[PDB]
Design an enzyme around this catalytic site. Sequence first.
Site, short mmCIF file in Angstrom:
data_model
loop_
_atom_site.label_atom_id
_atom_site.label_comp_id
_atom_site.label_asym_id
_atom_site.label_seq_id
_atom_site.Cartn_x
_atom_site.Cartn_y
_atom_site.Cartn_z
N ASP A 1 68.83 64.13 6.44
CA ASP A 1 70.11 63.43 6.42
C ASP A 1 70.38 62.71 7.74
O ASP A 1 71.00 61.65 7.76
CB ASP A 1 71.26 64.41 6.16
CG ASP A 1 71.88 64.22 4.79
OD1 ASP A 1 71.20 64.48 3.78
OD2 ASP A 1 73.06 63.79 4.74
N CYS B 1 70.36 60.05 -6.77
CA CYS B 1 70.83 60.55 -5.52
C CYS B 1 72.32 60.17 -5.66
O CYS B 1 72.71 59.59 -6.68
CB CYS B 1 70.10 59.89 -4.32
SG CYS B 1 70.20 58.12 -4.26
N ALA C 1 74.36 57.81 -4.82
CA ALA C 1 74.67 56.47 -5.26
C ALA C 1 73.58 55.93 -6.19
O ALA C 1 73.82 54.99 -6.94
CB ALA C 1 74.88 55.55 -4.08
N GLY C 2 72.39 56.53 -6.16
CA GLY C 2 71.31 56.06 -7.02
C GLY C 2 70.63 54.80 -6.54
O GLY C 2 70.03 54.06 -7.33
N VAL C 3 70.71 54.54 -5.23
CA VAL C 3 70.05 53.35 -4.68
C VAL C 3 69.18 53.61 -3.45
O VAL C 3 68.06 53.11 -3.37
CB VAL C 3 71.09 52.25 -4.33
CG1 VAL C 3 71.92 51.90 -5.56
CG2 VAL C 3 71.97 52.69 -3.18
N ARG D 1 67.90 56.85 -1.53
CA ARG D 1 66.78 57.77 -1.68
C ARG D 1 66.05 57.42 -2.97
O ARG D 1 64.83 57.34 -3.00
CB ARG D 1 67.30 59.21 -1.74
CG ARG D 1 68.20 59.55 -0.57
CD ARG D 1 68.64 61.00 -0.58
NE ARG D 1 69.51 61.29 0.56
CZ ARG D 1 70.03 62.48 0.83
NH1 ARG D 1 69.77 63.51 0.03
NH2 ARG D 1 70.79 62.65 1.90
N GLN E 1 68.75 51.52 0.33
CA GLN E 1 70.04 51.21 0.93
C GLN E 1 70.10 50.80 2.39
O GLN E 1 70.96 50.02 2.77
CB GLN E 1 70.98 52.39 0.71
CG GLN E 1 72.44 52.09 0.97
CD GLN E 1 73.27 53.36 1.06
OE1 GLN E 1 72.85 54.41 0.57
NE2 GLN E 1 74.45 53.28 1.69
#
Lengths: 282, 287
Positions: free
Chosen positions: A177, A211, A213-215, A217, A255
């Site tokens: 992270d 993940c 936001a899905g963008v 990772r 991202q």
Amino acid sequence: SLTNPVQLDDFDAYIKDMAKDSDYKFSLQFEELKLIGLDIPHFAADLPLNRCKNRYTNILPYDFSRVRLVEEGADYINANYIPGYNSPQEYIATQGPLPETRNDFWKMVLQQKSQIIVMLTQDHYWPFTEEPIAYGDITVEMISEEEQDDWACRHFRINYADEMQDVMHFNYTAWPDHGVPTANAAESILQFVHMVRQQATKSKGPMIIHCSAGVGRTGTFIALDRLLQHIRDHEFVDILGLVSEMRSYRMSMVQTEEQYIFIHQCVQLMWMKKKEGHHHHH
Amino acid sequence: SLTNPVQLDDFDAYIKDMAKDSDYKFSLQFEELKLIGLDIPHFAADLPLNRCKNRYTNILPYDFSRVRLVSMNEEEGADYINANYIPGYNSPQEYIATQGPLPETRNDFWKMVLQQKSQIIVMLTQCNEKRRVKCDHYWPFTEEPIAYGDITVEMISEEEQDDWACRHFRINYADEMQDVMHFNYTAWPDHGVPTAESILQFVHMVRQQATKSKGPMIIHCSAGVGRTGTFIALDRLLQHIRDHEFVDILGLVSEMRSYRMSMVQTEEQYIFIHQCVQLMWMKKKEG
């Protein structure tokens, strides 16, 4: 439009040049990627009733590649089909389900016949105990669970009416992270990727990846998964063209510049592994 | 999977190696390309009720990329048309590759044109070739507006030349009107090659119009795969060569085949694409 294939023989010199002048070219390329898909429609995601189905206000699926569920806004879910190394709809990049969308998520899994889900974060949309849970009209029961140091694999049995579907769930838990990914972080993730890929070549529908936001990772996982396979069969890599492509199917895939640079970090390691392997072709 | 970028600086050497031993390497690549997309389902195209909408029993649209006609509580199969979205140099669904409309589907075609908001149609076949039927003359013969289902089409102008014709159509559904430019290349025999200068100018012509248009560009010939696949490759390559120093024709043709089967039907057309790039390269070198 955005594409820059580099011979593996020149990747070392390439990344070094990408890094000079304080990562100037890494940044420039990322600035160019940010322009991809700005003119692609995403009206469905902005419809009043679907707004609450989005985790982040400005991360919306394009209308053309969005996965459609089969009422007003009833077909909506924040997810997009993404091209892969093997097929045009090999993956489904989606956000981590919200409590208000977990039933839609399981409906997508069943309808799309996905037998592999990849979670890149640590929301708990699946069962806690062996007790079968009903998410809307779909019942889900965890059959088994295996836990490794950096990941966990769960086998799910999903049913609806007479339909029954087995689904493997891979949750990577050691994703960094903060700080720059260590050589070990890269190694671990590349091992996880390789691991999921072995199961992939033995599954039905699209591979679901998410993940929060899905963008970020998610797009990184997809890029690495596709890169490992590509590097195995070819003598060049086009990272820029790859991320640009994902950007055309789902906004913000990969991202951050950080993740973009990381992908280059991993490819260098892949190249090192290929060279040291000296494996002939099968 | 199938991909082989080649720097333009050694495309000549590349082409000569591919042409070696009676196009040995070219054929090797084309055979690999013939395997692309075999596992992609096309269930809707298989439905008995849709058989009359397919010009050929073996040229069928994949389910995932097929273009869907929209209608209110319409009959079963009403959403079907033998057409697929194909990625372009600029966008994921830049082109719509489709078969040459049949008398039974001419209305469905216009419905697709209006609904998809296409402002450019590229026809690479003549309605008839060697006395053989290839495509229905789905548009008006005169300037008199013709009603195709609920869509009316008016041919505002018709300019013909040796190798092609340009027709300006104004189409409307009640108050929804749309201007559509129709470019018909007449010198490309089915299953063959223009037999480069001519076709390249055509591509450039359509490209100019494209820069002024919006919406997907509809591309069709007879079956919607051979000449249509070759044209799309050419259009995309022209733009690619303008901006980059390499080309990946193999990956390009492989990609099209993952969206619609048989794109670029013959080895000859496949080789013709390489020949065209060579010409495009030299033109670029004049600057």
